[PDB]
Each structure stands twice: as C-alpha cells, then as structure tokens.
Short mmCIF file of C-alpha atoms in Angstrom, two decimals:
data_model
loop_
_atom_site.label_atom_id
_atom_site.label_comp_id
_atom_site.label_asym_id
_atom_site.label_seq_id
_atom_site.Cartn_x
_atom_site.Cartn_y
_atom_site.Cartn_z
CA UNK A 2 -15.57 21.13 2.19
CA UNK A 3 -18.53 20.48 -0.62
CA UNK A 4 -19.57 17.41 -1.11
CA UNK A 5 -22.22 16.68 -3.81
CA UNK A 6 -24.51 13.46 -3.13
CA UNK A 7 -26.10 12.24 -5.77
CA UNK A 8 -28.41 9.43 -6.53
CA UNK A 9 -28.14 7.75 -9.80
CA UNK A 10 -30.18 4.60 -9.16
CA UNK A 11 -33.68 4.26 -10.19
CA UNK A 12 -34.85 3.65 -6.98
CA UNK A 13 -35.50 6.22 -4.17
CA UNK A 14 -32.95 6.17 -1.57
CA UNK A 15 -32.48 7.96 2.04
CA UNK A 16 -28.64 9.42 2.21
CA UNK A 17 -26.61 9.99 5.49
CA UNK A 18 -24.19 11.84 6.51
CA UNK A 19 -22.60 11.28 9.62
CA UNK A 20 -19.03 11.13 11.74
CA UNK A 21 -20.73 8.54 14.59
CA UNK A 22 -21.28 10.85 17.58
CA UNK A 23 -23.12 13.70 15.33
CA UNK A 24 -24.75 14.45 11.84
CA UNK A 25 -22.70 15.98 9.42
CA UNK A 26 -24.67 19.09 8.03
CA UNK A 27 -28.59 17.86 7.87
CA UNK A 28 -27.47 14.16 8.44
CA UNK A 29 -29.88 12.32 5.90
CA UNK A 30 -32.17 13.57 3.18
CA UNK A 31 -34.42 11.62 0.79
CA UNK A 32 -33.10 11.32 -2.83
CA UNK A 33 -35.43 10.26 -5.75
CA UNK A 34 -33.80 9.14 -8.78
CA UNK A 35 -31.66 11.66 -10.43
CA UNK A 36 -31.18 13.95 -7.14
CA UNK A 37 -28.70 15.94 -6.28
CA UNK A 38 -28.01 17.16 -2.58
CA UNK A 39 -25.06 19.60 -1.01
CA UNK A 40 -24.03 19.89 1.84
CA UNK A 41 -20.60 21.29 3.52
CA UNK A 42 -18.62 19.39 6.21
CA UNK A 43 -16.49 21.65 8.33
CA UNK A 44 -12.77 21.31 7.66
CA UNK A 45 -10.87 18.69 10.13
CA UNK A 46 -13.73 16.62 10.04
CA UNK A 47 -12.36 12.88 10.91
CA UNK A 48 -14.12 9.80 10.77
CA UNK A 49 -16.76 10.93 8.27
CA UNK A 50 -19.11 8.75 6.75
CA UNK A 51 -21.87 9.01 3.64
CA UNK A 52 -23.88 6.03 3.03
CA UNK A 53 -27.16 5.37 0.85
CA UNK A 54 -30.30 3.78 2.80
CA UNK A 55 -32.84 1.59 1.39
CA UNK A 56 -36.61 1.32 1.63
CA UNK A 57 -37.44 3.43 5.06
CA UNK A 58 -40.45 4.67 6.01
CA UNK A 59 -40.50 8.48 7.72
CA UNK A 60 -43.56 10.08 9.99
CA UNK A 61 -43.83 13.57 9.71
CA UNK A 62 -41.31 13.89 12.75
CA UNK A 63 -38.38 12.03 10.90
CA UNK A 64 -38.66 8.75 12.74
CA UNK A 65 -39.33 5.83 10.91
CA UNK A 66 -37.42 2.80 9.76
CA UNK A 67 -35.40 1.61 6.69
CA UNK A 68 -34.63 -1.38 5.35
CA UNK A 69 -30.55 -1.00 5.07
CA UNK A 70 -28.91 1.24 7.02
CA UNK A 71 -30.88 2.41 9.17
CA UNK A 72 -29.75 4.72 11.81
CA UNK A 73 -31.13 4.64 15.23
CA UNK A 74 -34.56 4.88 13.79
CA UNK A 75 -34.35 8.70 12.24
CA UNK A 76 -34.26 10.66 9.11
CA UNK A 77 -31.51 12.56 9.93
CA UNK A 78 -28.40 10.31 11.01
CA UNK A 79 -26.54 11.36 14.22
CA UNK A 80 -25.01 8.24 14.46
CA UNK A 81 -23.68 5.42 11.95
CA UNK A 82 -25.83 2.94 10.13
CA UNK A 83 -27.30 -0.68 10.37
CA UNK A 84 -25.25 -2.90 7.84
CA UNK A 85 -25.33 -3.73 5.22
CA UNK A 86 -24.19 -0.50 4.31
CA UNK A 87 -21.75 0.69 0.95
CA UNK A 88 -19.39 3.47 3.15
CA UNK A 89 -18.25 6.06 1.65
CA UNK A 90 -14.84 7.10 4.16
CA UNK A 91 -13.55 10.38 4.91
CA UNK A 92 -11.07 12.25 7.29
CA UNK A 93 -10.40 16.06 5.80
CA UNK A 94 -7.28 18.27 6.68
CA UNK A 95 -5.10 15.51 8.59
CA UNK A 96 -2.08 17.52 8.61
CA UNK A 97 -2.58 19.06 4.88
CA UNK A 98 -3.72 15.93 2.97
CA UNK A 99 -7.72 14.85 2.86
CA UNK A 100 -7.92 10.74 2.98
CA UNK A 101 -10.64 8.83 1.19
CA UNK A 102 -12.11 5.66 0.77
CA UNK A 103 -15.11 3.35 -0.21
CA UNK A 104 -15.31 0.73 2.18
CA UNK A 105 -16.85 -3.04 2.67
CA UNK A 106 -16.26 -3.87 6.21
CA UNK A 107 -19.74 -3.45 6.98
CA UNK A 108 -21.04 -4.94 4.01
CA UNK A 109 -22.72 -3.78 0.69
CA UNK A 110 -25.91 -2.12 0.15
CA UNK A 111 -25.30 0.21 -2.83
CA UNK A 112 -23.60 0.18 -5.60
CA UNK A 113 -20.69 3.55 -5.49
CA UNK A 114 -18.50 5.53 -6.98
CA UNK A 115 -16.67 8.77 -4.44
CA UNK A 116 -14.39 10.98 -6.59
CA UNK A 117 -12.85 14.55 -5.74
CA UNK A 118 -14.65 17.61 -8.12
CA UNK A 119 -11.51 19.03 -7.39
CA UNK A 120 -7.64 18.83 -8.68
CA UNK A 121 -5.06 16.33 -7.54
CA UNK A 122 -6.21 13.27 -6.60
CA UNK A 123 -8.47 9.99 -8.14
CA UNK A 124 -11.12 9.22 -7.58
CA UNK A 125 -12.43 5.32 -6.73
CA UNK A 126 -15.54 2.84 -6.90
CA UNK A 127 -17.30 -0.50 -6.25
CA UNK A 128 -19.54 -0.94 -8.53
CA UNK A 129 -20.23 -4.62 -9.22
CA UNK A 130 -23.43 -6.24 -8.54
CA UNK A 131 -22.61 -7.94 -5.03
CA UNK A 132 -26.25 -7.79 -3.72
CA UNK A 133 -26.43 -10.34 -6.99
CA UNK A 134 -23.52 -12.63 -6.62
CA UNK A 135 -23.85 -12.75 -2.40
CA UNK A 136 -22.64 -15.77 -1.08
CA UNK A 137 -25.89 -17.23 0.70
CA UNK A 138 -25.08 -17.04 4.31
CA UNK A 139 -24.51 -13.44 3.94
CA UNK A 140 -27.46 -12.23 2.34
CA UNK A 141 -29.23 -9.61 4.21
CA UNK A 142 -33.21 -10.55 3.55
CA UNK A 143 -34.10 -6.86 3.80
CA UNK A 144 -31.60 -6.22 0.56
CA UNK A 145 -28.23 -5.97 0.79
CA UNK A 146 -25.05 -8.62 1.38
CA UNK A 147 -23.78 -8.51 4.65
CA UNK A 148 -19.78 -8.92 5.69
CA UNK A 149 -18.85 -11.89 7.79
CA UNK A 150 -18.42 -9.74 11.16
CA UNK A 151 -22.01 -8.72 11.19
CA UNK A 152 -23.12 -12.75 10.56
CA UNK A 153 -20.76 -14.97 12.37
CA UNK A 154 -19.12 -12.04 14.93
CA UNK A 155 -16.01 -14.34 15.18
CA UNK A 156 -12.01 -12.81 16.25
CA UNK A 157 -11.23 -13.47 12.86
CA UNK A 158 -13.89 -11.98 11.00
CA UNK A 159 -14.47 -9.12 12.98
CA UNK A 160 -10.28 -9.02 13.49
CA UNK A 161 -10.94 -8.09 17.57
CA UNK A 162 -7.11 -9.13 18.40
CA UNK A 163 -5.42 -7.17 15.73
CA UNK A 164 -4.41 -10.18 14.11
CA UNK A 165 -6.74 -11.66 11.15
CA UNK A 166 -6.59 -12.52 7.73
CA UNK A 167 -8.45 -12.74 4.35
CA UNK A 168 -11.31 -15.21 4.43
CA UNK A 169 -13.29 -16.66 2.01
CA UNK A 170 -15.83 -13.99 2.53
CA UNK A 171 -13.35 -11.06 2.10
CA UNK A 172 -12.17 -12.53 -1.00
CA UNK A 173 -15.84 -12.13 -2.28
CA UNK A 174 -15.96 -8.88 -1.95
CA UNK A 175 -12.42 -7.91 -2.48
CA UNK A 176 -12.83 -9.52 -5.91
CA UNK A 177 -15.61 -8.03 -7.21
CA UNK A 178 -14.14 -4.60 -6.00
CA UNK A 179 -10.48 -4.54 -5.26
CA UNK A 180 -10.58 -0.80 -4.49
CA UNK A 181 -12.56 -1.17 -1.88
CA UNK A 182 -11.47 -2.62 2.01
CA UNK A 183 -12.67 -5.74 2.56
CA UNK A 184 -11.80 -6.70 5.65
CA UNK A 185 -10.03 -4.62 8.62
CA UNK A 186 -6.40 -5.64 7.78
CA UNK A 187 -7.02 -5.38 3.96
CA UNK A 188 -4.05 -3.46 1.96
CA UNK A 189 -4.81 0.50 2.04
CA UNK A 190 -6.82 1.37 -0.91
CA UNK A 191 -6.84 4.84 0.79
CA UNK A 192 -6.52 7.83 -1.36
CA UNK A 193 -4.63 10.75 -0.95
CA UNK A 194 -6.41 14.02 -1.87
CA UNK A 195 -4.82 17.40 -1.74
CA UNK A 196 -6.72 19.19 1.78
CA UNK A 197 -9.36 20.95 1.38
CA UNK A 198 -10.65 19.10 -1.62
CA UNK A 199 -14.29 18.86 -2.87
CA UNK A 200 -16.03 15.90 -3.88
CA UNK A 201 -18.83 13.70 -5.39
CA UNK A 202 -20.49 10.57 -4.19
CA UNK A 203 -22.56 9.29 -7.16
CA UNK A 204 -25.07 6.06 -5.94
CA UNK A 205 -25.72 3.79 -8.92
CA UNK A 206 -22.81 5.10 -10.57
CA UNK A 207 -23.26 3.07 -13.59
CA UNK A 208 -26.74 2.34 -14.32
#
C-alpha cells in the first residue's frame, strides 16, 4: 500500500511511521510546510501507526530529541511515540478489508485528517483546536494536550481491567472530535476500506 504524508501546517514537523516493534518504510522524515512524502507499507501490515512530531532536534546520525512524540530518541521511528501524539491507525488486508482510524488515546499533538486516495471507503478527521481548548491538568508544556492515562495512570483512565467508562476528560476530546477514539472503550469510529487501498494523511488539514 501507498500512503502519501503530507504536511499542511506552517510549521516544520518530523513524521513517523511505525507498527511498534519496527519502522514502517524509512520510519520518520522531516517535513517543511507544504511537503509531501511516500512511502509503501507491505500488505498485512497490522498495528500501523503515522504520527506528526514537533520541535526535535537531529545530529547528523539521526539522534536527537523532539518535543512531542518523540521516539526513543531517533529520526527514524522503530518504535511508537512519546504522547501527546494525534495517531493516525492502520491494520491492511485483515481478511480482505483494510481498517482505519484517527485516534486520541494517547492524546493530541496535531491537528489530522487520514482519507483513502482510493475507491470505496471515507475518509475521517480531528481537526479542532484541542492544543487550544486543553483542559489545564492535561496540557503537555512541551505543546500538545495530553489524555488522562498518560497524567493520572489510573484503572479507569488507562481502562487496565477491561472495564471503564467515559470521563470528563474523554468527553473533551470526544467532543471536539467525535470521529476520533477517545478513550479505550469508546464506540468504533473504525472505518472500513476496501483491502489494498491507498491513502493520504494530510497534517494541518485545514489551515
């Protein structure tokens, strides 16, 4: 599969691409404002994730640091990011149908939008400007609004027994973008592609 990354904001920021225990293609690249990158995850891929990263600083070796999802310290992401992080969800060929998401479990960096090029399917976004309206106690210093699991790492927030519910913090995030999960237990807002779909994840979709 081809998936386009592109980076609408007007700020710099460091992609990823990642399914936790290796990179996907390169595994991070710097974007500047208006940049596109390709890359092509191999078919079956399950637990994929693309997220944007924030003000990082790279040596010439591709260690450094960023400021929101940062990822063990390197340029190019073998494993999954620091939160807050937007996440952009993916598992590809699960017996013929690609599944896709944006998620908020581990908070909200960037603002998103993760639609198929393809035919078949929708596509879906969070958008809103949560960094903005963050409740106080989650609000990450370095940028970014943090979910309740990260702060308070509680049962319920973090949903450990199986067994949670919305909170107050969910509810924040869930209502500035319903299509997004907000919490582990949150209604699907899963999306069903056709397999072997192609797709698009736009940063700064609207500005």
């Amino acid at each position: 599969a081809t998936f386009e990354i592109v980076n609408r904001c007007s700020y710099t920021v460091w992609a990823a691409a990642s399914k936790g225990d290796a990179a996907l293609d390169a595994g991070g690249r710097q974007l500047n404002s208006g940049e596109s990158w390709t890359i092509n995850v191999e078919p079956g891929t399950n637990g994929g994730k693309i997220w944007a990263r924030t003000d990082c600083y790279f040596d010439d070796s591709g260690s450094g640091i960023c400021k929101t999802g940062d990822c063990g310290g390197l340029l190019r992401c073998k494993r999954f990011g620091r939160p807050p992080t937007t996440l952009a969800e993916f598992s590809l060929n699960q017996y013929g149908k690609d599944y896709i998401d944006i998620s908020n479990i581990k908070g909200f960096n960037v603002p998103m939008d993760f639609s198929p090029t393809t035919r078949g399917c929708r596509g879906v976004r969070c958008a809103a400007d949560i960094v903005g309206q963050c409740p106080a106690k989650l609000k990450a210093p370095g940028g970014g609004c943090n979910d309740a699991c990260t702060v308070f790492q509680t049962s319920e927030y973090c949903c450990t027994t199986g067994k949670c519910g919305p909170t107050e913090y969910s509810r924040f995030f869930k209502r500035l973008c319903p299509d997004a999960f907000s919490y582990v237990l949150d209604k699907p807002t899963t999306v069903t592609c056709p397999g072997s779909s192609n797709y698009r994840v736009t940063f700064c979709p609207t500005a």
